[PDB]
Structure formats: C-alpha cells, structure tokens
PDB file of C-alpha atoms and ligand atoms in Angstrom:
ATOM      1  CA  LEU R   1       0.000   0.000   0.000  1.00 47.87           C
ATOM      2  CA  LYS R   2       2.846   2.331   0.920  1.00 49.61           C
ATOM      3  CA  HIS R   3       6.137   0.420   0.785  1.00 50.14           C
ATOM      4  CA  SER R   4       7.091   0.903  -2.887  1.00 49.66           C
ATOM      5  CA  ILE R   5       5.708   2.640  -5.999  1.00 52.64           C
ATOM      6  CA  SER R   6       4.570  -0.752  -7.395  1.00 54.34           C
ATOM      7  CA  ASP R   7       2.055  -0.845  -4.455  1.00 52.67           C
ATOM      8  CA  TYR R   8       0.301   2.147  -6.055  1.00 52.43           C
ATOM      9  CA  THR R   9      -1.969   2.105  -9.083  1.00 53.59           C
ATOM     10  CA  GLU R  10      -1.373   5.236 -11.202  1.00 52.13           C
ATOM     11  CA  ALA R  11      -4.705   6.659  -9.907  1.00 51.09           C
ATOM     12  CA  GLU R  12      -3.731   6.281  -6.251  1.00 51.28           C
ATOM     13  CA  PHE R  13      -0.330   7.837  -6.960  1.00 52.23           C
ATOM     14  CA  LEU R  14      -2.133  10.852  -8.551  1.00 50.57           C
ATOM     15  CA  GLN R  15      -4.186  11.210  -5.350  1.00 48.35           C
ATOM     16  CA  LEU R  16      -1.003  11.414  -3.226  1.00 49.08           C
ATOM     17  CA  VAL R  17       0.584  13.984  -5.533  1.00 51.43           C
ATOM     18  CA  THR R  18      -2.630  16.043  -5.614  1.00 52.49           C
ATOM     19  CA  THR R  19      -2.730  16.071  -1.779  1.00 51.47           C
ATOM     20  CA  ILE R  20       0.906  17.380  -1.698  1.00 56.36           C
ATOM     21  CA  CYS R  21       0.470  19.998  -4.440  1.00 56.84           C
ATOM     22  CA  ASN R  22      -2.621  21.444  -2.676  1.00 54.17           C
ATOM     23  CA  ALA R  23      -1.008  21.354   0.825  1.00 55.48           C
ATOM     24  CA  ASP R  24      -4.150  19.385   1.862  1.00 54.60           C
ATOM     25  CA  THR R  25      -2.848  18.378   5.282  1.00 55.10           C
ATOM     26  CA  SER R  26      -3.475  18.981   9.009  1.00 52.18           C
ATOM     27  CA  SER R  27      -0.043  20.457   9.767  1.00 52.93           C
ATOM     28  CA  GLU R  28       3.218  21.519   8.094  1.00 53.26           C
ATOM     29  CA  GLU R  29       4.884  18.424   9.651  1.00 53.54           C
ATOM     30  CA  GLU R  30       2.351  16.108   7.998  1.00 53.67           C
ATOM     31  CA  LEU R  31       3.033  17.725   4.580  1.00 51.10           C
ATOM     32  CA  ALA R  32       6.836  17.330   5.009  1.00 47.10           C
ATOM     33  CA  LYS R  33       6.347  13.615   5.856  1.00 47.80           C
ATOM     34  CA  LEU R  34       4.255  13.157   2.689  1.00 48.29           C
ATOM     35  CA  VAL R  35       6.894  14.858   0.461  1.00 47.10           C
ATOM     36  CA  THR R  36       9.631  12.567   1.973  1.00 46.03           C
ATOM     37  CA  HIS R  37       7.382   9.561   1.210  1.00 48.47           C
ATOM     38  CA  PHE R  38       6.944  10.728  -2.399  1.00 48.33           C
ATOM     39  CA  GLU R  39      10.790  10.981  -2.811  1.00 48.64           C
ATOM     40  CA  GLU R  40      11.268   7.444  -1.428  1.00 47.42           C
ATOM     41  CA  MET R  41       8.638   6.044  -3.840  1.00 44.48           C
ATOM     42  CA  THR R  42       9.902   7.736  -7.023  1.00 46.52           C
ATOM     43  CA  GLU R  43      13.639   7.279  -6.286  1.00 46.57           C
ATOM     44  CA  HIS R  44      14.134  10.260  -8.707  1.00 42.35           C
ATOM     45  CA  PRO R  45      17.467  12.053  -8.189  1.00 43.70           C
ATOM     46  CA  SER R  46      15.692  15.477  -8.150  1.00 44.82           C
ATOM     47  CA  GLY R  47      13.722  14.625  -5.012  1.00 45.00           C
ATOM     48  CA  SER R  48      11.217  17.252  -3.974  1.00 48.23           C
ATOM     49  CA  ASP R  49      12.326  19.499  -6.875  1.00 47.79           C
ATOM     50  CA  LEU R  50       9.819  17.566  -9.052  1.00 46.86           C
ATOM     51  CA  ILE R  51       7.011  19.195  -6.999  1.00 49.83           C
ATOM     52  CA  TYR R  52       8.466  22.677  -6.203  1.00 53.24           C
ATOM     53  CA  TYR R  53      11.307  23.512  -8.702  1.00 53.46           C
ATOM     54  CA  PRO R  54      10.408  22.030 -12.118  1.00 53.76           C
ATOM     55  CA  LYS R  55      12.886  22.084 -15.002  1.00 53.02           C
ATOM     56  CA  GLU R  56      12.044  24.539 -17.857  1.00 51.85           C
ATOM     57  CA  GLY R  57       9.034  23.314 -19.844  1.00 51.88           C
ATOM     58  CA  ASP R  58       8.117  20.627 -17.261  1.00 47.82           C
ATOM     59  CA  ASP R  59       4.407  20.443 -16.328  1.00 44.46           C
ATOM     60  CA  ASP R  60       4.156  20.832 -12.474  1.00 45.45           C
ATOM     61  CA  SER R  61       0.393  20.066 -12.298  1.00 47.85           C
ATOM     62  CA  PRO R  62      -0.336  16.778 -10.395  1.00 49.66           C
ATOM     63  CA  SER R  63      -0.981  14.932 -13.688  1.00 52.63           C
ATOM     64  CA  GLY R  64       2.238  16.482 -15.102  1.00 50.70           C
ATOM     65  CA  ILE R  65       4.291  15.258 -12.119  1.00 50.68           C
ATOM     66  CA  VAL R  66       2.816  11.765 -12.334  1.00 56.39           C
ATOM     67  CA  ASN R  67       3.705  11.625 -16.074  1.00 50.71           C
ATOM     68  CA  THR R  68       7.295  12.748 -15.410  1.00 50.22           C
ATOM     69  CA  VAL R  69       7.732  10.032 -12.736  1.00 49.25           C
ATOM     70  CA  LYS R  70       6.086   7.341 -14.923  1.00 45.64           C
ATOM     71  CA  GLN R  71       8.355   8.177 -17.876  1.00 45.85           C
ATOM     72  CA  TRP R  72      11.499   8.452 -15.765  1.00 47.29           C
ATOM     73  CA  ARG R  73      10.981   5.079 -14.094  1.00 43.52           C
ATOM     74  CA  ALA R  74      10.227   3.473 -17.520  1.00 42.12           C
ATOM     75  CA  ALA R  75      13.330   4.992 -19.108  1.00 44.81           C
ATOM     76  CA  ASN R  76      15.639   4.092 -16.204  1.00 45.67           C
ATOM     77  CA  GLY R  77      15.007   0.351 -15.727  1.00 43.81           C
ATOM     78  CA  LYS R  78      12.637   0.481 -12.771  1.00 43.51           C
ATOM     79  CA  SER R  79       9.344  -1.135 -11.924  1.00 40.08           C
ATOM     80  CA  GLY R  80       6.175   0.900 -12.423  1.00 40.03           C
ATOM     81  CA  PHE R  81       2.639   1.231 -11.116  1.00 38.55           C
ATOM     82  CA  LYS R  82       0.376  -1.655 -10.101  1.00 40.97           C
ATOM     83  CA  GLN R  83      -1.588  -2.888 -13.213  1.00 36.82           C
TER      84      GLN R  83
ATOM     85  CA  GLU W   1      10.538  26.670  28.590  1.00 32.19           C
ATOM     86  CA  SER W   2      11.560  29.106  25.806  1.00 30.61           C
ATOM     87  CA  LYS W   3      11.783  32.916  25.339  1.00 32.00           C
ATOM     88  CA  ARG W   4      10.350  32.769  21.819  1.00 32.38           C
ATOM     89  CA  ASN W   5       6.986  31.720  23.370  1.00 30.78           C
ATOM     90  CA  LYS W   6       6.201  35.030  25.115  1.00 31.15           C
ATOM     91  CA  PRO W   7       3.839  37.485  23.331  1.00 28.36           C
ATOM     92  CA  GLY W   8       5.199  40.658  21.713  1.00 28.87           C
ATOM     93  CA  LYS W   9       4.641  43.357  19.086  1.00 28.71           C
ATOM     94  CA  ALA W  10       6.443  43.270  15.751  1.00 28.73           C
ATOM     95  CA  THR W  11       8.757  46.216  15.088  1.00 27.00           C
ATOM     96  CA  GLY W  12      11.397  47.272  12.503  1.00 26.27           C
ATOM     97  CA  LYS W  13      11.759  48.501   8.904  1.00 21.65           C
ATOM     98  CA  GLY W  14      13.022  45.500   6.865  1.00 21.61           C
ATOM     99  CA  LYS W  15      14.773  46.115   3.483  1.00 18.17           C
ATOM    100  CA  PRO W  16      13.965  46.471  -0.225  1.00 15.99           C
ATOM    101  CA  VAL W  17      14.166  43.061  -1.975  1.00 16.45           C
ATOM    102  CA  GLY W  18      13.888  41.875  -5.593  1.00 18.27           C
ATOM    103  CA  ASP W  19      13.056  38.770  -7.662  1.00 21.77           C
ATOM    104  CA  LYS W  20      16.177  37.062  -6.161  1.00 20.90           C
ATOM    105  CA  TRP W  21      14.961  37.407  -2.564  1.00 19.26           C
ATOM    106  CA  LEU W  22      14.867  33.720  -1.628  1.00 17.41           C
ATOM    107  CA  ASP W  23      18.142  32.960  -3.499  1.00 19.39           C
ATOM    108  CA  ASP W  24      19.802  35.215  -0.822  1.00 18.76           C
ATOM    109  CA  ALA W  25      18.530  32.875   1.954  1.00 18.28           C
ATOM    110  CA  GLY W  26      21.279  30.367   1.248  1.00 18.18           C
ATOM    111  CA  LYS W  27      24.105  32.933   1.543  1.00 17.94           C
ATOM    112  CA  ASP W  28      25.815  35.037   4.227  1.00 18.05           C
ATOM    113  CA  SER W  29      23.445  36.003   7.048  1.00 12.56           C
ATOM    114  CA  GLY W  30      20.345  35.066   5.032  1.00 11.21           C
ATOM    115  CA  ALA W  31      17.791  37.323   3.259  1.00 13.31           C
ATOM    116  CA  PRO W  32      16.219  40.288   5.146  1.00 14.39           C
ATOM    117  CA  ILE W  33      12.471  40.594   5.967  1.00 13.95           C
ATOM    118  CA  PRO W  34      11.082  42.610   2.952  1.00 14.15           C
ATOM    119  CA  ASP W  35      10.145  46.242   3.754  1.00 16.48           C
ATOM    120  CA  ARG W  36       6.695  45.378   2.262  1.00 18.96           C
ATOM    121  CA  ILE W  37       6.044  42.551   4.763  1.00 14.50           C
ATOM    122  CA  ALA W  38       7.300  44.653   7.690  1.00 14.14           C
ATOM    123  CA  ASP W  39       4.747  47.339   6.728  1.00 13.98           C
ATOM    124  CA  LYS W  40       1.956  44.800   6.953  1.00 15.46           C
ATOM    125  CA  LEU W  41       3.065  43.308  10.317  1.00 12.30           C
ATOM    126  CA  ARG W  42       4.392  46.310  12.246  1.00 11.96           C
ATOM    127  CA  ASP W  43       2.607  47.029  15.579  1.00 10.96           C
ATOM    128  CA  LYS W  44       0.622  43.748  15.470  1.00  9.08           C
ATOM    129  CA  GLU W  45       0.672  41.599  18.607  1.00  4.59           C
ATOM    130  CA  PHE W  46       1.828  37.999  18.343  1.00  2.06           C
ATOM    131  CA  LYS W  47       1.277  35.219  20.885  1.00  2.00           C
ATOM    132  CA  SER W  48       4.559  33.408  20.065  1.00  2.00           C
ATOM    133  CA  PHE W  49       7.333  33.512  17.529  1.00  2.00           C
ATOM    134  CA  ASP W  50       5.676  30.600  15.714  1.00  2.00           C
ATOM    135  CA  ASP W  51       2.550  32.768  15.268  1.00  2.32           C
ATOM    136  CA  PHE W  52       4.730  35.551  13.786  1.00  2.00           C
ATOM    137  CA  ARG W  53       6.294  32.985  11.376  1.00  2.00           C
ATOM    138  CA  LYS W  54       2.794  31.906  10.136  1.00  2.00           C
ATOM    139  CA  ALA W  55       1.980  35.588   9.577  1.00  2.00           C
ATOM    140  CA  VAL W  56       5.093  36.202   7.441  1.00  2.00           C
ATOM    141  CA  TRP W  57       4.265  33.293   5.064  1.00  2.00           C
ATOM    142  CA  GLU W  58       0.577  34.351   4.818  1.00  2.00           C
ATOM    143  CA  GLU W  59       1.658  37.888   3.808  1.00  2.00           C
ATOM    144  CA  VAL W  60       4.100  36.414   1.260  1.00  2.00           C
ATOM    145  CA  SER W  61       1.201  34.349  -0.207  1.00  2.00           C
ATOM    146  CA  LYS W  62      -0.729  37.629  -0.776  1.00  2.00           C
ATOM    147  CA  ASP W  63       2.213  39.626  -2.148  1.00  2.00           C
ATOM    148  CA  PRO W  64       2.487  39.754  -5.919  1.00  2.00           C
ATOM    149  CA  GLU W  65       6.196  40.603  -6.130  1.00  2.00           C
ATOM    150  CA  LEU W  66       7.124  37.980  -3.481  1.00  2.00           C
ATOM    151  CA  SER W  67       4.759  35.103  -4.426  1.00  2.00           C
ATOM    152  CA  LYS W  68       5.271  35.391  -8.213  1.00  2.00           C
ATOM    153  CA  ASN W  69       8.653  33.682  -7.636  1.00  2.00           C
ATOM    154  CA  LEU W  70       7.129  30.498  -5.951  1.00  2.00           C
ATOM    155  CA  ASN W  71       5.451  27.636  -8.002  1.00  2.00           C
ATOM    156  CA  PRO W  72       1.748  26.606  -7.617  1.00  2.00           C
ATOM    157  CA  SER W  73       2.623  23.895  -5.035  1.00  2.00           C
ATOM    158  CA  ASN W  74       4.698  26.266  -2.888  1.00  2.00           C
ATOM    159  CA  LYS W  75       1.923  28.877  -3.178  1.00  2.00           C
ATOM    160  CA  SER W  76      -0.547  26.358  -1.660  1.00  2.00           C
ATOM    161  CA  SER W  77       1.868  25.871   1.216  1.00  2.00           C
ATOM    162  CA  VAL W  78       2.390  29.585   2.079  1.00  2.18           C
ATOM    163  CA  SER W  79      -1.397  30.232   1.806  1.00  2.81           C
ATOM    164  CA  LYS W  80      -1.759  27.956   4.846  1.00  3.70           C
ATOM    165  CA  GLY W  81       0.976  29.872   6.726  1.00  3.10           C
ATOM    166  CA  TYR W  82       3.366  26.949   6.082  1.00  5.71           C
ATOM    167  CA  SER W  83       7.021  27.735   5.275  1.00  4.84           C
ATOM    168  CA  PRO W  84       7.828  27.110   1.519  1.00  2.00           C
ATOM    169  CA  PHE W  85      10.091  24.203   0.503  1.00  2.00           C
ATOM    170  CA  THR W  86      13.659  25.067  -0.549  1.00  2.00           C
ATOM    171  CA  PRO W  87      15.544  23.449  -3.491  1.00  2.00           C
ATOM    172  CA  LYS W  88      16.675  19.914  -2.572  1.00  2.00           C
ATOM    173  CA  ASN W  89      20.354  20.898  -2.350  1.00  2.00           C
ATOM    174  CA  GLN W  90      19.631  23.391   0.445  1.00  2.00           C
ATOM    175  CA  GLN W  91      17.737  20.843   2.584  1.00  4.04           C
ATOM    176  CA  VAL W  92      19.305  18.850   5.434  1.00  3.63           C
ATOM    177  CA  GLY W  93      17.337  15.669   6.224  1.00  5.24           C
ATOM    178  CA  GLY W  94      13.901  16.381   7.683  1.00  6.27           C
ATOM    179  CA  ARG W  95      14.606  20.150   7.499  1.00  8.51           C
ATOM    180  CA  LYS W  96      13.287  20.936   4.019  1.00 10.73           C
ATOM    181  CA  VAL W  97      11.720  24.450   4.291  1.00 12.29           C
ATOM    182  CA  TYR W  98      12.923  28.082   4.733  1.00 13.12           C
ATOM    183  CA  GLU W  99      13.771  28.886   8.373  1.00  9.54           C
ATOM    184  CA  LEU W 100      13.581  32.235  10.266  1.00 11.29           C
ATOM    185  CA  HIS W 101      16.886  33.152  11.945  1.00 15.29           C
ATOM    186  CA  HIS W 102      17.708  35.785  14.578  1.00 14.48           C
ATOM    187  CA  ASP W 103      20.805  37.712  13.550  1.00 20.02           C
ATOM    188  CA  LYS W 104      21.715  38.651  17.126  1.00 21.98           C
ATOM    189  CA  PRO W 105      20.636  35.440  18.970  1.00 21.38           C
ATOM    190  CA  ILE W 106      17.766  35.648  21.504  1.00 19.75           C
ATOM    191  CA  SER W 107      19.878  33.617  23.954  1.00 16.54           C
ATOM    192  CA  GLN W 108      22.327  36.575  23.667  1.00 15.52           C
ATOM    193  CA  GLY W 109      19.719  39.285  24.211  1.00 16.46           C
ATOM    194  CA  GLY W 110      18.543  39.711  20.595  1.00 14.84           C
ATOM    195  CA  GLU W 111      14.971  40.895  20.071  1.00 17.34           C
ATOM    196  CA  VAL W 112      12.397  38.227  19.242  1.00 18.03           C
ATOM    197  CA  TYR W 113       9.976  40.262  17.111  1.00 17.08           C
ATOM    198  CA  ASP W 114      12.266  42.994  15.751  1.00 14.97           C
ATOM    199  CA  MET W 115      12.112  42.395  11.970  1.00 13.76           C
ATOM    200  CA  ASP W 116      15.503  44.133  11.528  1.00 16.30           C
ATOM    201  CA  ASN W 117      16.927  41.261  13.594  1.00 17.99           C
ATOM    202  CA  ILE W 118      15.243  38.515  11.517  1.00 15.78           C
ATOM    203  CA  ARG W 119      16.599  36.758   8.410  1.00 15.77           C
ATOM    204  CA  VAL W 120      15.223  34.093   6.050  1.00 18.71           C
ATOM    205  CA  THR W 121      17.641  31.112   5.736  1.00 18.75           C
ATOM    206  CA  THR W 122      17.798  27.699   4.042  1.00 16.67           C
ATOM    207  CA  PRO W 123      18.342  24.695   6.397  1.00 20.27           C
ATOM    208  CA  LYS W 124      21.897  24.215   5.007  1.00 21.67           C
ATOM    209  CA  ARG W 125      22.869  27.858   5.643  1.00 23.30           C
ATOM    210  CA  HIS W 126      21.134  28.118   9.062  1.00 25.48           C
ATOM    211  CA  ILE W 127      22.886  25.046  10.520  1.00 25.35           C
ATOM    212  CA  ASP W 128      26.225  26.356   9.388  1.00 23.96           C
ATOM    213  CA  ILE W 129      25.614  29.733  11.043  1.00 22.76           C
ATOM    214  CA  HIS W 130      25.031  28.122  14.446  1.00 18.19           C
ATOM    215  CA  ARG W 131      28.053  25.814  14.106  1.00 14.52           C
ATOM    216  CA  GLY W 132      30.176  28.947  13.703  1.00 20.48           C
TER     217      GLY W 132
HETATM  218 ZN1   ZN N   1      19.356  31.152  13.895  1.00 22.21          ZN
END
C-alpha cells in the first residue's frame, strides 16, 4: 500500500501527488512527511524538486508530475505502477 | 521553557528586496524581511514567535512581487501559513523548508519580534551559522 511505488496504481499515486500539491494536510509536519514519502517512492534524483522547482518546460500540475515520474521510471530500468 | 513563546509586538523597517529574494537565503546572514512585509506586520501583537512565522508566510502568499517567484505547489503551502520548501540541495534531512533566523541570537539578548533582527535562511545555511 505504501512500501514501494509498485504498491500504487497510477490513480492512487495521482491522489497522493494532488494532496501534496494542494497542501491538503493537518499540519506543516504532515506535509513534510508526505513529500519525503513521495521521494522514497519515485527514487528520482531530483527529489522534492519535481514538486516545487520544475525544469524549464516541465508540467508541475499533479498529472504532469505523475507523467514525469512514470516516464522516468520506464526509461531508467525500474518497476512501475500496479496494473 | 523558551523565550520565543512570550507574546510581543512586531517592530522594525526591513529592506527592499527583488526577484532574487529567496536565493539570498542560502548565503551570508540570510535574506532580510522585505520592507513590504514589515509594513503589513508592524505594531501587530503575536502570541509566540511561531505565530509571527505563520503571519510572514501568509503575507508572502498575498504579495504579488514575493509570491510570483514560488510555483503553484509552494503557493498552496504559504497560503496555509506553512514555510515554503527550498531546493533539494539546500535541505538537510527532515529540514526541508525556509527557516527564520535571529541575527543577534535571543539567547544573547537579541529581540524576538524585531524584523531588523530577523533573516530568512535555508536549512543548510542556518545550521552552518550556528556551528560557527
Ligand atoms: Zn538562527
């Protein structure tokens, strides 16, 4: 459910990213925990920059971020979403 | 328990800043409190330093010249009075957001709510300051 990215369907992963992008949490601490979780799931070298400091031309909407992660994982030899 | 938890009124002028405001937070003594923010907060009473911090980020969220340089996700954060996330390379572990620093330390008699004594820092820069 929460141990690796392969435990997420794409739709569930979008829900996580949407929650982070909208700061839809009870406290700052809870948001920081969620962002750390995201970084551990993607394993992307840019870390939280994917959410907060996009590269030029990169779509930082929730759907945009999910696409960037999905493509990066696929291009770099890693397992993807459930189903 | 801590001196930053006693109520006080915000004071001080702050300084003119530009589009590079938050880039300054990872250098030297940090970035100053913008003159524009200081104008909004001056003479207001705050219950704790943490309450003052929330107020700063809420005013940044409403400020066109200061918020324009944050992305939609960071905007959502400051609208809640949360501190904005820094670039990954300025984070240190669980410390991932901009931190407010007292230039003359409170433990050394510095003023808690004097905006001329407050700086915005990244986690990496702030830790280094207090390590000498
Ligand atoms: Zn400090």
